Design a binder for these strands. Structure first.
Ligand SMILES: [Mg+2]
Ligand SMILES: [Mg+2]
Ligand SMILES: [Mg+2]
Ligand SMILES: [Mg+2]
Ligand SMILES: [Mg+2]
Ligand SMILES: [Mg+2]
Ligand SMILES: [Mg+2]
Ligand SMILES: [Mg+2]
Ligand SMILES: [Mg+2]
Lengths: 77, 100, 271, 149
RNA sequence: CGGCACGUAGCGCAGCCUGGUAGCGCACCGUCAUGGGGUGUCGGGGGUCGGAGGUUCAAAUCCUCUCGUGCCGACCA
RNA sequence: CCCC
RNA sequence: GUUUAUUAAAAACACAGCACUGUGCAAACACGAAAGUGGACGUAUACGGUGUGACGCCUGCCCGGUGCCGGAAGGUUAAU
C-alpha cells in the first residue's frame, strides 16, 4: 500500500479543477521511495518504504527512536 | 611439398621474442619432414608508409619447403594473432640461400 | 533446398518447402524436452493482449544451451534436428565426459565435427569464446548482453553480427538491422552465421500453411466499424483519416522508443 | 547541515568542525562509515569529552599500523604465474581475488578492499606497478611480476 | 490586450545600430556589340526610406506614436 | 553565346 | 474457406504474396491505479501495426494543405 512506514502518510483524493471549474476527480500520493537506512545499534542496514518528509524526520529524530515508535505501533521493519 | 620463400613483418612489441617463435614456426615443418633453406631475419627496419599508423617493422623470411596442408596452417597462424602483419608467400621456385 | 511444388492443385501453385535431408528424421532427445503450453494472446487475466494470434500444431520446447559454460571440454556433434520453435536447425552434441546437449546450427556444421567453448579454444564455427579473446572484424551469432546471461542476440536463421571494433573494455557491434551498439567485452559469443539461411524464401502458398503455424487472421480496419477501429465506417471504402493503431497511436511513422536506460550503448541507430 | 567530524576528512574538514554539508553526502557516506555525526548536544558532549582528546588521538595511533602494513612485505615484489596466453595476452585477467589470496598466503595482510588498481584490470604480461592503500593517509607501493604457469 | 518584425523607384533588395552624400540587381528608354540577332557592355529617366512628431550640428540609419500586414502568447460584462 |  | 443464430451468403471478410512503418530485448505493443503477465521461455531470415490483396505487364507528376521525421539560428512562451 502506498503508505509511509514512518509517518502513516497515505493517498488522499481531491479534485482537478480546471480553468472553467469542471472538477474531475484526482488523487494525491506521497513522494514515496524505498531507502536503505543504517542502524548502528544493530550494526546493520534496514530497508523501508518512506517519504521525503520522513527522510528529514529521521534526520531530526534518529534511527532508534523511530524504531521504538514503529515497534509500539506494531509494524515490521 | 613445394619450395616457398614466405616472408612476414612483425610488430616491435614481439619483435624481441622472435627467437622464441622461430623454433615453433619451423617445427611444424621439420616434423613434416620439410626442408629449410634459409632464415633471413632482416630485423627492425623503417617502413615506407604508415602501417596502422606505425613507424617501424621487423622483417623475417623463411626460405623453406613444406606441404600445403601445413603451409596454410602457418598462414592462418600468422593471421589469427596480432603479432605478424603483411605477410607474403611465393611458389614453386627453387631455394635461394643468399641475397641478404 | 527449395522445391517449387508441382501445381497438382490449388494450394501448391505457389508453395516452396525448405527441406534439408541432412537432419535427423527420427525422434529427439527426451531429457531435453519440456512441455510448452499454448497461451494464445491471453495472459493471466485473459483479455487477449496481442491480436493476430491463435492456435496451431502442438510443439515441445527443447532445452537449448545459450550460456555455453562448459568452457574447456570438447564436444562431438552427434547429429542435427528440427526445432519448430525458432526458425533454425538444432545440433545435438555430446561432450567427452558425458552430457549431451543441444545448440544452434552455425550454418557450417556437419555431424561428426568436434568443437569446444571457452577462453583457451580455437577459432572455428561453433566455438564460443569471450569477445576479448576474439579477432575483430569477425562474424558471429548468439551474442550475450551481460557476462553470463546466456545470449539474446542474433540467433534467428541466417543471421550474424560483424564485430567492427573494441573500445578498450567495451566492444562495438553491427547488428543485422543497421544498428551498432557498444557492449561489454567479457561477454560471450559463437563464431559463424546460423543455419537454415534459406528460410527467408520458405513460401507458404496456403492459408492453412500459417493458420497451423500459429498465425490467426488479422483484419483490416477500414472494414471494421467505427466502434472497433478509428479506420472503421464509411459508405464505400473511405479512409479519410491518418493510419493509426486500434488504440489511437499513429503507425507508419512515430518512433516509440522511449527507454533512455540504454542509449549509453547505442552508437548509431538504424536508418 | 551542521554535522560534526569524527576524524580527518578527505577535504573541507580537519577535526571537530561544523559544516553545512549536503544531506546526500551525510546520510549515505559520512555518518555510516564513521566519519561524522549530526549536530546534537549529546554528540557535542561526547565529542568535546571523549573524542577531542582521546578517540581522535587513538585514531592517530592506527597510523602506526598503517605505516607498518605499508612496508610489511619483506619482498615488496609478488610474482603471479597463472598461464601463458598464446605468447600474447593473459588468459585469466588478474583482479582483486587473485591478489588477496597471494598476499594472505604470503604474509602481507591485505584485503580485497585495500587494493587500488590505477587503470582498471591488467590484461598484459609483464612486471608492473600497483598502489596499495591501507589507509587514506598511508599509501604503499608494491611491484608485481606477471608470469605464466 | 503585450512583444516582435516587415514596409527603400514597377519588382525584389542590402541600407535593418554601430546617424553623415538613398544604393544594388530586375524592369524601362537609348546608344554601342552583330553580316542581321540574344545576352553583353556604357549610360538615362523613375524613389524621399508607409505616414506623423521629436533627438540631432546632422535621420533612415535613433526614440515615440500611428497606418497597414503577418506571427507567438493573453482574454469569465 | 545564338543565328543565316 | 468465413459471415448478418431468427428475411441478405455475395462482387462483402479473411487468405499465401507485396509494400510501408515501428521495435536492440527489463524490447516495441496490449490487460492492469500495481505487482506482474501475453508478446516469448521468441529475440530483426524475429515480432507488432497499417494498406493492397495470387500469378503475369506495371506502380506515372505534385511536399502547396494535414500528419510524421530531422535542425536549434532567431521571435514567442508556464510553473519557480
Ligand atoms: Mg459533478
Ligand atoms: Mg513459436
Ligand atoms: Mg496480412
Ligand atoms: Mg464511394
Ligand atoms: Mg474524398
Ligand atoms: Mg452460420
Ligand atoms: Mg511492466
Ligand atoms: Mg504553414
Ligand atoms: Mg517536429
Amino acid at each position: 500500500s502506498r503508505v509511509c512506514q514512518v509517518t502513516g502518510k497515505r493517498p488522499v483524493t481531491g479534485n482537478n479543477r480546471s480553468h472553467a471549474l469542471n472538477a474531475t476527480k484526482r488523487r494525491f500520493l506521497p513522494n514515496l521511495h524505498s531507502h536503505r537506512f543504517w542502524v548502528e545499534s544493530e550494526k546493520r542496514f534496514v530497508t523501508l518504504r518512506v517519504s521525503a518528509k520522513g527522510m528529514r524526520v529521521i534526520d531530526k529524530k534518529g534511527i532508534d527512536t523511530v524504531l521504538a515508535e514503529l515497534r509500539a505501533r506494531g509494524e515490521k521493519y | 611439398m613445394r619450395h616457398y620463400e614466405i616472408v612476414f613483418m612483425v610488430h616491435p612489441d614481439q619483435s624481441e621474442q622472435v627467437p622464441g617463435m622461430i623454433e615453433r614456426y619451423t617445427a611444424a615443418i621439420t616434423g613434416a619432414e620439410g626442408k629449410i633453406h634459409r632464415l633471413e631475419d632482416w630485423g627492425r627496419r623503417q617502413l615506407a608508409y604508415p602501417i596502422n599508423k606505425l613507424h617501424k617493422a621487423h622483417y623475417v623470411l623463411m626460405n623453406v619447403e613444406a606441404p600445403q596442408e601445413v603451409i596454410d596452417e602457418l598462414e592462418t597462424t600468422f593471421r589469427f594473432n596480432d603479432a605478424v602483419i603483411r605477410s607474403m608467400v611465393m611458389r614453386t621456385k627453387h631455394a635461394v640461400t643468399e641475397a641478404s | 533446398a527449395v522445391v517449387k511444388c508441382k501445381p497438382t492443385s490449388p494450394g501448391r501453385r505457389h508453395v516452396v518447402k525448405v527441406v534439408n535431408p541432412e537432419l535427423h528424421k527420427g525422434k529427439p532427445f527426451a531429457p531435453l524436452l519440456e512441455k510448452n503450453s499454448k497461451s494464445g494472446g491471453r495472459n493471466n487475466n485473459g483479455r487477449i493482449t496481442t491480436r493476430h494470434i491463435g492456435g496451431g500444431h502442438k510443439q515441445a520446447y527443447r532445452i537449448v544451451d545459450f550460456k555455453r559454460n562448459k568452457d574447456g571440454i570438447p564436444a562431438v556433434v552427434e547429429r542435427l534436428e528440427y526445432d519448430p520453435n525458432r526458425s533454425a536447425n538444432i545440433a545435438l552434441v555430446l561432450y567427452k565426459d558425458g552430457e549431451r546437449r543441444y545448440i544452434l546450427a552455425p550454418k557450417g556444421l556437419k555431424a561428426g565435427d568436434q568443437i569446444q567453448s571457452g577462453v583457451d579454444a580455437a577459432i572455428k564455427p561453433g566455438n564460443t569464446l569471450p569477445m576479448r579473446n576474439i579477432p575483430v572484424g569477425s562474424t558471429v551469432h548468439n551474442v550475450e548482453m551481460k557476462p553470463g546471461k546466456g545470449g539474446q542476440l542474433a540467433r534467428s536463421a541466417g543471421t550474424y553480427v560483424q564485430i567492427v571494433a573494441r573500445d578498450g573494455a567495451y566492444v562495438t557491434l553491427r547488428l543485422r538491422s543497421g544498428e551498432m551498439r557498444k557492449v561489454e567485452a567479457d561477454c560471450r559469443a559463437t563464431l559463424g552465421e546460423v543455419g537454415n539461411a534459406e528460410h527467408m524464401l520458405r513460401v507458404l502458398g496456403k492459408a492453412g500453411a500459417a493458420r497451423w503455424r500459429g498465425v490467426r487472421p488479422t483484419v483490416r480496419g477500414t472494414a471494421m466499424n467505427p466502434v472497433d477501429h478509428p479506420h472503421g465506417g464509411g459508405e464505400g471504402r473511405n479512409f479519410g483519416k491518418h493510419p493509426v493503431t486500434p488504440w489511437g497511436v499513429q503507425t507508419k511513422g512515430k518512433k516509440t522508443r522511449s527507454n533512455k536506460r540504454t542509449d549509453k550503448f547505442i552508437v548509431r541507430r538504424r536508418s | 547541515m551542521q554535522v560534526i567530524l569524527l576524524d580527518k576528512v578527505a577535504n573541507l574538514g580537519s577535526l571537530g568542525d561544523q559544516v553545512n554539508v549536503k544531506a546526500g553526502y551525510a546520510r549515505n557516506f559520512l555518518v555510516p562509515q564513521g566519519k561524522a555525526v549530526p549536530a546534537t548536544k549529546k554528540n557535542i558532549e561526547f565529542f568535546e569529552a571523549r573524542r577531542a582528546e582521546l578517540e581522535a588521538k587513538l585514531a592517530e595511533v592506527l597510523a602506526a599500523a598503517n605505516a607498518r602494513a605499508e612496508k610489511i612485505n619483506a619482498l615488496e615484489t609478488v610474482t603471479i604465474a597463472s598461464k601463458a596466453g598464446d605468447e600474447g595476452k593473459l588468459f585469466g585477467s588478474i583482479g582483486t581475488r587473485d591478489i588477496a589470496d597471494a598476499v594472505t598466503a604470503a604474509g602481507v595482510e591485505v584485503a580485497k578492499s585495500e587494493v587500488r588498481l590505477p587503470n582498471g584490470v591488467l590484461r598484459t604480461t609483464g612486471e608492473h606497478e600497483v598502489s596499495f592503500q591501507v589507509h587514506s593517509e598511508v599509501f604503499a607501493k608494491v611491484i608485481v611480476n606477471v608470469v605464466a604457469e
